[PDB]
Amino acid sequence: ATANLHLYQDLQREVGSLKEINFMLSVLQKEFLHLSKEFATTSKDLSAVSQDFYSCLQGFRDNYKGFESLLDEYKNSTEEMRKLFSQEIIADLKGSVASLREEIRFLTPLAEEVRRLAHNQQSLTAAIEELKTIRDSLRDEIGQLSQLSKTLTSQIALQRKLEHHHHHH
Keywords for this entry (predicted)? Predict the structure, then answer.
């Protein structure tokens, strides 16, 4: 089994990446709020998908809180708490992080590409379809991450309460 210090270092790397992903998704969220309002009277379908990006990216930081919390538990940890450093779940997280980074890569140019097309009286049909496809992929990835994170939050919270309870004596 992988040493807990190495799993801590793996988690440190992935939580650092999650914080970058969170920041980049906050920028993209705001960009799609703008796009949604800009296009509300010009392209109802573009406006609706743009509002969907705004909505599905709400509270993204909360969707990895269990990982961030786990990382924060290592420094002065008990042996029991360190059982929550699961090599399978940290390896699974690495896949989520990579997939989210790639979704960002594909999404990054698309709002200003829509604006460019619209300013030139060009069709938005293909762009709208691409946006709906990325929205669906991103919802799937965020759901998978959120479930892993929420499980960890529950486990850490209970173990922390238990360890604090022992300080009655």
Answer: Membrane, Transmembrane, Transmembrane helix
